[model samples]
Structure formats: C-alpha cells, structure tokens
Target: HTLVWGVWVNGVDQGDGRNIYIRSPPNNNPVKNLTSPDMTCNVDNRVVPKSVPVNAGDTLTFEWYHNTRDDDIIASSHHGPIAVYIAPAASNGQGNVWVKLFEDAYNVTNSTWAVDRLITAHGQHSVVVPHVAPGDYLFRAEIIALHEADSLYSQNPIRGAQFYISCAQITINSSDDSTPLPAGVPFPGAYTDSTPGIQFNIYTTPATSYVAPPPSVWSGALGGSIAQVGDASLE
Candidate 1:
C-alpha cells in the first residue's frame, strides 16, 4: 500500500490534502495548477518507499510536490525558485554535507544548469537514480525565492513569504548478503565566494561644474591671480 503524508508550511498543515502521487510521465513537462482551490505554493511533500529491496542493477524513483511559485523569474532580474542542496543519509548532520552544485556559489557559469520551464501553479516532479548498497538514507528538498520588490543587492533582502518541505527516510539493500561498500565517498572542498553568475553594468554622467587650471604666461607678465597679491600684502 502507498502511504500519504500531509504537506505543511511553517508548521501549519495545509488544506484537505487532495494532492495525490503519480509516476512522473517520461519527458512530459511538469505542470503546477494554481487554479485548484486547495493547491499551495509553499509546501513540498516528499515520498519514500517503506521497503529496502534492491539488486546490483536496480533503480529507485523519487517524487515530490514542487510548488510553481518556486520557479525562477527571468525578465524581472530576480532569481526564481532554486534547490539549495541534496544529501544522501551518510552525510546528514555532518554540517554542509548536502551538495550545493545547483546554487550560485558553484554555478559560476549559467550555461551548466538551465531552468527551462516554470510552473506558476502547484504540481509534481519525479526523478530516478541507480540504486546503491542496502542502507538507510534521508532525502531533503529545499525551496527558496525572492520577493518582487526586493533589490538584488539589498541587505536583509526580501525572500519568499513561506517555504516548506516534507523529508522522507528510506533503507536500501540487496536481496542477498553481498557486501556493499560504505556510502560512496563525499566530494571535496568548500567554495570561496557566493556571488551568482549573472553580471550587469551601472552608468553615470560626468559633472560639468569644474574648471581646469590656467596655462603659464610669458616671462614678462606676472601669472599670479589678484587673490595671491592680497595674501602677499597681508604677510
């Protein structure tokens, strides 16, 4: 039997929980329907399998509710929805264990990751990865957005009004007792900067009130201004 979990925002449970799980259709663009009266834009529901059975070549599918409001906005010069990091169980609680390759710090070139589509409503997305040796793991989802009126460089910049996710823990193992290596080794080193990859220019006009110094006069005439003569008389 498939188990269902209710999604919440800031600790408060959402509407009548009509959201259901469906296998993500291959190549079909995920859609978020804001028209649904009960649909929400800040809550994500993560689902995990209850059993742990895998063979050497097995595959696992993961699914979740991705709110449309989380998608990035292109024309507004504002960063849209983004996933901060994803970590397998072994690295949990180790601090910075989650991989943040999709964020600004690692995405030095926008060419690498592309936000091809945006779902302005609520909807579902699914992904599949090859199975690893039997063990327990936790999957976390992170969603973030910027407010429409907030400037890109403002301190304490505006952020989304609400953000939430439901994490699911699962165990994976082979049917037979063949030893599997400990969870795969972690990647290396922290980044030095956190600036996003995009760039822009600021322009200013030149001031007109300043004047250049006068050029030297011939040897016969004095070059000093009347103000200099007044100073010499005082001395």
Candidate 2:
C-alpha cells in the first residue's frame, strides 16, 4: 500500500492532491480489481483541483509514501514496475485517450525492480512530460506491486497484483503540435487477468526477465520515433 503525496514541479512541492485526484482516508491501499472504474484513478469520486502548468518536456516528480510523505516508502516485498500516463482533463478520470508516457519494470543486470529504485530515492519517481497537444490533461503515476501476483486474478480474487495509482491535473504549454498522439488505451481495458505482467511470479529463483503491461510506451513522435528530453530519474 502506497500513495503519491505531492507532485514536485520546478523544485516546488504542490501539496497533497493540490493538483491531483487521490483516494480518501489518505491510506496506502491499492486497487485490486483491474476492471473496476477505480482502476482509472483509484477513486470513483473526486474534486477538480487546479492544474499544474508546465512546458512539453518538463519533468514532474511524484512523491509516494506508505502512509505519510516521509514514512517508509512501502513494504520491501512489493516488487514490480512503475508507469506514467496522461490524458485530456475531464470531469472524472475517464476516456480512451490516455497515453503511456513512461514505464520501467526491472533492471536485469543488477536485478533491481522499479519499486526498489523508488524506495532508494526516498519515495520519489520522476517522469519527463511528452510532446502532447497543448491543453489540460490528467497525469497518472502508478506502481504495480507483484508480491502477490503469482496466480491469475480471475482464478483467485485476492491473488493479483496490487495497483497503487494517483492522478494529477496539468496544463501543457508546448508549441510543437505536429507529432501525432496515439490512440491511447483505457485504464481498465489496458490489462487483463492473464496478462503476463499482471500474473507474474516475482519469487522465481534467479529472476531475469520481465514484461511491462500492455499499450507500449509512446515514442512522442510520428512513425514510432522517440523524442523525449532525457531519462527520467529521482531528484
């Protein structure tokens, strides 16, 4: 169980949910049902908050914590990938226009998981903004904990990966509008019970391979060309 506490922009900390839509109770609970609407943003009901303004290639840091911003990041056993997404800002975090901005699953050489790096950074995960159409958008940061994902969720309700998600509102001021955006995938529709990434066995001895969830990472350019600023890392 983990939650994003703030969105760091331009060295400024936009306090909890200031520009984001998160779950109530402020707990570190995760969404288990992949088909539930809560999979979109982790909460069905939300309040429209101010949007963080930034340029196309700006970097946004998502701050996560087990219970509070400075608490233990999360259980060391919650190993898995980290993903980021952005969609046109709407009333609720709905629609099939969400684009995969970034994804980091496992580092084979050192055998390190994405959550491992996030914890090493003191609960901060950074992402580079993509060259998307200038407008209001919903930014999503997620960590899929696979500690309990050895079995298919369809077979057992409580045996799936735990999805810790959060969404922030942002206004992109990019001048480049020539790049074509992909036909983004829906959150609940992007994954399934049997998706390899969703039903993996992280406990396998000498683990060496991993496949991130579907809807491949966007290249932020036409013809599958990747044109981002640089690699995204913790601050």
Candidate 3:
C-alpha cells in the first residue's frame, strides 16, 4: 500500500513529503528515525539530495504520490521492475558502487510488469540522460516491489521484498562524450535470490515471458527509459 515520489522535485524538499529516499536494508549506517521498514521520509537521514541538473539529453522526472497526497492506490499487488543507477561521486555512495543506467523490464510487448501498473498509468516517468564524461553523479531510482518476493520472502526483510529506494544528486552537463559508460550491478549484489528477474511467477504463473535484471538497458552511451520514456511526462 505504498506509492511515493509524487512531489517529484527539481530542487529542495528536505521536509514533509520530500517523497522518500530510504528503505530496504540499504541502510548500513543511516539512522535517526524514518523507521527501517520505512520511517516514512520525515526528515534527516537521506534527504540531503540536491544537485538536480540535467542536460546531456533530457528527461528525469517521476511522480507517484499515493499516501494521502491524493491519487489513491491502496494497492492490490506489487508488480516488478523499474531501475536507474549511476555512481561516481567518487564511489562514496557505495552499494558496492552503483552503475546501471536504466531499465523498465517486463513488458513483453505489453503483458505488463506491474509496478502497481507503473504507478497506475504512468504518474509521470522518464529518464533519458547518458552522454557521459560530464561530471558529478549519483542518481538512483528504483522500484522492485514484487509483492513480497515469492522466493519464500527474504532479504532486507522489513517483511521482505520491497525496495523503493531513491537518490538524486546529479550534475551531468555534457562537454560531449566518446563512449565509456558501462558497468553497473552492485546493490547488495544486484538482484539475487536466485535472480530470474527476481524469481518469476508474477502471481501463480504458467510463465510464458518476463526476464530482465542485470545491467541491462542501454539506448545511447548508457542512456535509459523503461516505465515510460514515452518521450515525455513531467507533469
């Protein structure tokens, strides 16, 4: 019953519904409330984000507010896939050193991958920035919610299987590039509970499709889009 990031930002929001930036067992040493299972992004511990610049090929918006900010989605079952990553803030933002650029897996032509139906019909989603060699980065955006991960439910067990992790401290201006952006997969070791795109069977399946997870998604110099890079959606 959780859906966030709605108030998608362009700058400061260090308070109220800054729209979460923490959850999952990614908390190695970040604390001061916000409950581990989701302290509910009140303040402190992970909302220090504010770099926001973008221009090496635009688009980086995502809004999915549902916890009272209106646009209800009491949830029926969490579906899967929606990834984005970048690292090079000197690797200080280590989760084994992030890298993947973009992914919106499971949509074999339109069978659906269910991230609550991609925030109930795309509540704004886009990410088309990869012309690297620019500078300063650390922009992660995730959504793996596979409805209590069926593999017997484990890992980061805040009742297990739910990772809405977020991050943004970007600055990729672009002085033009040559092509040297690849290598990303390290978040407690990518996705591994026997990763078949995180143990398929999207809900008692006769399984005919769906399989994506592991440094995938590359349009140009590591560019990306998955949920709806439908070319636009900022409002």
Candidate 4:
C-alpha cells in the first residue's frame, strides 16, 4: 500500500502533509469500497490549514510512501496505475466536479506500468498543474493497486482493487481567465465495482491494452511532460 506523503510545487518541496489531508496514523492502508464517501479524498474529517500556490503549467512532484517518508514505496504486488484529478475548492469536493488532469497506465511496448514508473522514481511522481482558471482547488492523487482485483467485492469484500488516495489544497495562479472550466465526474459515481479496470486479473492475463476507468481525461487539463526530479542537469 502507498499514499502521497509530500508534494513539491514547481520543484519546491512543500514538506510532508503540508496541505494534504493525510491519514491519521499515516499507515499505508487502502480504500476498497467503490461507493464509499472516502472515495472523494481518503480523509475528509479534517482540513489542512494552508494551500500551496503554483502557476498553471507548473510541475508538481508527488512523494509517496508505504507507511512514512522513509519506508518502502509500495509492495511489488501493488501494480496498477496512477491518476490525478482536480476540483474547485469552493465546491468542497462534492458532486460531479472533478476533472481528470493526468493518468498513466500500462505500457505494452515497454512492459511497464504507471506504478512501475513511480517505483523507479523512488515514489516521486511528477505531473504538470493543469491550465485551469485561477482559483483554489483540491488536487487529488490516486494509485490503483490491482493485485487482487480478479474477484469482485460481491465475490469477496476483501479481494478487489485497492485505492490509495490523498488530496492537496492548491491555489492556482493563472492570468488567463477566458478559458471556461470543463465538465467533470464524481468519484463514487464515476467508478463502480464492476468497472473493467477495477475487477481485473493482472497476474493471469496479458494486458495488450489497458484503459483506465473513465470520464476521460479533460483535453484542456493536459500540460507539460513530467520532469525527472533528480537529474543533475535540472539542478
């Protein structure tokens, strides 16, 4: 299991759990119920005091961990994908207001998965801040662990996909205000237990092509490519 423990906005490390509502004990547990309210933001009972600031198109690096910042990134069995979504902060993250910003799944050519790329980076997954209108927003990061997704929750409640999720509050500073926000989908309503991506069998079948469960990515949300956090040249 894994959860985003720290975030770097525009290459500046914002510190662990600075603006994210991380779990209380900081354990690497995952949320498995598809329809639960926890699907929105892992932990909603509390709110972080501050919101990180970044210009649109800025690169954000998500630092994930198994239990804490120093532990294993995640178990090898937890192989699947990573996706990021954004919602207006004023909405309080309710209803169908989340627009997918980024997502990486399987690479049939390289035989690598999104989780593999994250693991290779030592749990640092970077993505650009989408070019949305200036405003405060909740940026959600998620990891879908498909190790035991072969069975449905109905088949066995404990034997389905696992979702490690967290949310960070961010105030986007963008000068452009002409672009209108795109439509989005709700967390619990967007995914179901029967979703192909959720009820998959990673070990037995060869995934020639894999598509993440949808409300497809918002075209307006795509930004710059992910940067290598520790490349010497970038320093």
lDDT of each: 0.25, 0.72, 0.52, 0.74
The TM-scores of all predictions, comma-separated, are: 0.35, 0.86, 0.29, 0.89
Question: Model 3 segments beyond 4 Å from truth?
Answer: 1-46, 55-79, 83-105, 109-126, 129-140, 145-160, 169-203, 206-235
Identify the leading candidate in terms of lDDT.
Answer: 4
Q: In candidate 2, which residue pairs clash?
A: none
Query: How many residue pairs clash in all the candidates, one count each?
Result: 6, 0, 2, 0
Q: After superposition, how far is residue 157 of candidate 2 from its true place, in Å?
A: 1.9
Could you tell me which 10 consecutive residues in candidate 2 have the lowest summed lDDT? 222-231
User: What does the lDDT read for residue 140 in candidate 1?
Assistant: 34
Which predicted model would earn the best TM-score? 4
Cα lDDT tens digits, model 3, 114-200, are: 464566554445566677778877666666665645543454444445565555556677648655566655555556566666656
Better of 2 and 4 by lDDT: 4
Model 3, residue pairs in steric clash:
34-39, 35-39
> Over all chains combined, what TM-score does candidate 3 have?
0.29
Better of 3 and 4 by lDDT: 4
lDDT of 4 by residue, 97-197 (tens): 99888888887887888887677776777767766789888888889988888887756997888888878777888737454678898876788865658
What is the overall TM-score of model 4 with all chains considered together?
A: 0.89
TM-score of 2: 0.86
